[PDB]
C-alpha cells in the first residue's frame, strides 16, 4: 500500500518506511534490494532443483529446503553469543579458566 500511494503521491519511498520492516516477511524485505535482482529473476524452479541435488553430490544438504538469495535469511543468532557470554560469567569469569593471565597481555580487547 505504501508503494501504490507513493506512486499516487509520486513521492519516493524513503528508508524510513522500510527500516521498521527490514527483516520481516517470508521472502524477506531485504531481498527486494539485493544486488542481483536482475539475474535472479530468471532462475525458476530452484526449489525442485535443490531437492534433486541429492542425486548428484555425495553430501547431504541440511538446508535443502531454502535458498538465501531467494528466501532472504530466515534467522539471526547474534544475541546468542552475547547472552552465552553473560551466562558463562562474563569475559572475566570466562578468562579465569584460561592461561590468559600467564600471558601478561595487558587486557583482552586486543587478543587475535
Amino acid at each position: 500500500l505504501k508503494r501504490q500511494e507513493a506512486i499516487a503521491q509520486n513521492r519516493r519511498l524513503t528508508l524510513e518506511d522500510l527500516e521498521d520492516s527490514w527483516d520481516r516477511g517470508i521472502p524477506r524485505i531485504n531481498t527486494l534490494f539485493q544486488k542481483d535482482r536482475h539475474t535472479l529473476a530468471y532462475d525458476k524452479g530452484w526449489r525442485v532443483r535443490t531437492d534433486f541435488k541429492q542425486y548428484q553430490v555425495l553430501k547431504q544438504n541440511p538446508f535443502w529446503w531454502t535458498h538465501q538469495r531467494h528466501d532472504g535469511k530466515l534467522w539471526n543468532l547474534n544475541n546468542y553469543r552475547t547472552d552465552m557470554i553473560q551466562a558463562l560469567g562474563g569475559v572475566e569469569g570466562i578468562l579465569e579458566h584460561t592461561l590468559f593471565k600467564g600471558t601478561y597481555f595487558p587486557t583482552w580487547e586486543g587478543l587475535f
Binding site: 539475474t39 525458476k44 524452479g45 542425486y55 548428484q56
Partner: protein, 112 residues
C-alpha cells in the same frame, strides 16, 4: 541466453565451494566452467550444437550415499554434458514457468 548460462554455471560451481582436494575430473570441470565464464559465446554455440545434433552420450557412473537407514543413488555425469544439461534445465524451467505449464498444485514450488 547469458542470464540462463550464468545461472547454470553458478549452480555447477556451488558443488566445489570448499575448493577441496578434489581430483583430476573435478579439476577438469572447473576448467571448463571458468573458460565458459570468460568466453560465453563459444560456450553457447557448442551448447546449441549439442542440443541439435547429439544423440549418443558417454557413460554415467553410479555410487551410493549411505544414510544408515536407506541408501541413495548418486549419479556422476561428465562435464561437457553437465554444462549442456544445466543450460537446458534452466531454459526449460524458465519457459515452463512463463507459459504456465504446471498447475498450482504441483508443489515443491518457488513461492513458499
Amino acid at each position: 541466453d547469458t542470464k540462463l548460462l550464468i545461472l547454470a554455471l553458478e549452480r555447477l560451481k556451488e558443488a566445489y565451494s570448499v575448493k577441496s582436494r578434489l581430483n583430476q575430473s573435478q579439476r577438469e570441470e572447473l576448467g571448463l566452467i571458468e573458460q565458459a565464464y570468460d568466453n560465453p559465446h563459444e560456450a553457447l554455440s557448442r551448447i546449441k550444437r549439442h542440443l541439435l545434433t547429439q544423440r549418443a552420450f558417454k557413460e554415467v557412473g553410479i555410487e551410493f550415499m549411505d544414510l544408515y537407514s536407506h541408501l541413495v543413488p548418486v549419479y556422476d555425469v561428465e562435464p561437457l554434458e553437465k554444462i549442456t544439461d544445466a543450460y537446458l534445465d534452466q531454459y526449460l524451467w524458465y519457459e515452463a514457468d512463463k507459459r504456465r505449464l504446471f498447475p498450482p498444485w504441483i508443489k515443491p514450488a518457488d513461492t513458499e
